[PDB]
Amino acid sequence: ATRFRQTRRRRGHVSMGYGRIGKHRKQRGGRGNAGGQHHRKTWFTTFHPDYFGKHGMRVFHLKANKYYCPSINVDSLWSLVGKDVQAQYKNAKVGEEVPVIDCVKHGYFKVLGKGFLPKQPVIVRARYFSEKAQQKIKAVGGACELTA
């Protein structure tokens, strides 16, 4: 909407809101990130203080698929099957059927341990596990399974 711009409100003002002493000229210190070390050094120091330099080792061809590992905490495990199933198997223990949570089938590879699990036995199947993830699953009365 060009009728809501400031140009329509500054009609009649000579300088169009840019100043009489310091005019609106072509440039204001260079094109792009010019003067990163000379006159805009106070800008880069203030707002991007690690912009110039080198850090870490180069990876000539990075295989970004090798780092792909979606994670889910323990407290979020039961949301994969829903609350209806969670309450249905609420009073299970060793010996009878217990629901299996297929983390991989839902797109989660690693299971981390954060928050608190509901006090029901459960079988967790995933590719990777954390030390506290397995502790919390086992302390509730469940098991851990590997995949792939």
């Binding site: 792909y68 009878e96 217990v98 299996v100 469940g142 098991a143």
Partner: protein, 266 residues
């Protein structure tokens, strides 16, 4: 925020605008319809394998590939010279990746051949194949009389056990320990008895039927059956199994091969 905008070249000559998009749909759709009218089983989008995706990021998913390998055609009893003429993709470049891939795509072809209805090469009722089917029809009646005696006397000890499992599971859903053990014990015995020669090629299903025209065979034969909620019985072994040390032992085994080789030469 430091800006990174690559407009320092003549982007005005690099601008591609999509004003032809609403007419690509009309072009492609009309040509797609024109193909169906000309010869319908050409736009049929000939049958394709079920092949896994690559890399560990995708490897649990299935997707259509290009062409059935020559070993999958032999297992499904189809000549590769006839496969391309009845809407089957064939890819000799595909190496067999696993037995399970060989079995899964063998089921796909067999299921496709059952749903397939090949019309006679010549529409006349005096076609040689139609005449030949009449000539050997009485032989088929004799032969099919033996195909039914078999697979009615050999798969009978497991059928009752298989029936009992369904009834016992139905009763449980209203035991399974001994019900499933009996079927398992028979299955190993059955697998021990098969260890003998089957026809190289099956027959092409050729007949005269009213043409029900289907635009693709890939959406009829689904890649993956719908996933339900798998449920398992908790045992003491499942509780005991400590998965973290299995992960860390497996990692440390692979990272100690350097130490093994270094210590050998010393």
């Amino acid at each position: 925020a430091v800006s990174n905008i690559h407009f320092c070249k003549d982007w005005r000559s690099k601008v591609h605008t999509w004003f032809k998009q609403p007419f690509r749909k009309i072009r492609r759709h009309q040509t797609r319809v024109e193909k169906a009218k000309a010869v319908f089983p050409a736009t049929i989008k000939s049958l394709k394998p079920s092949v896994h995706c690559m890399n560990q990021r995708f490897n649990y998913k299935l997707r259509l590939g290009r062409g059935f390998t020559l070993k999958e055609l032999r297992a499904a009893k189809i000549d590769k010279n006839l496969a391309r003429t009845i809407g089957i993709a064939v890819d000799p470049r595909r190496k067999e990746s696993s037995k399970e891939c060989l079995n899964r795509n063998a089921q796909r072809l067999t299921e496709y051949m059952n749903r397939l209805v090949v019309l006679p090469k010549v529409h006349a009722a005096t076609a040689k194949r139609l005449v030949l089917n009449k000539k050997n029809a009485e032989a088929k009646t004799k032969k099919a009389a033996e195909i039914k005696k078999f697979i009615a006397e050999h798969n009978k000890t497991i059928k009752e056990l298989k029936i009992k499992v369904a009834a016992a599971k139905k009763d449980y859903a209203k035991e399974l320990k001994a019900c499933l053990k009996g079927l398992k014990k028979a299955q190993v015995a059955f697998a021990a008895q098969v260890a003998k020669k089957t026809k190289q090629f099956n027959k092409l299903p050729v007949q005269q039927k009213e043409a029900k025209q289907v635009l693709d065979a890939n959406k009829v034969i689904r890649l993956t059956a719908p996933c339900t909620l798998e449920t398992k019985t908790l045992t003491k072994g499942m509780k005991a199994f400590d998965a973290v040390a299995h992960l860390r032992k497996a990692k440390n085994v692979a990272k100690a091969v350097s130490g093994i080789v270094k210590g050998q030469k010393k």
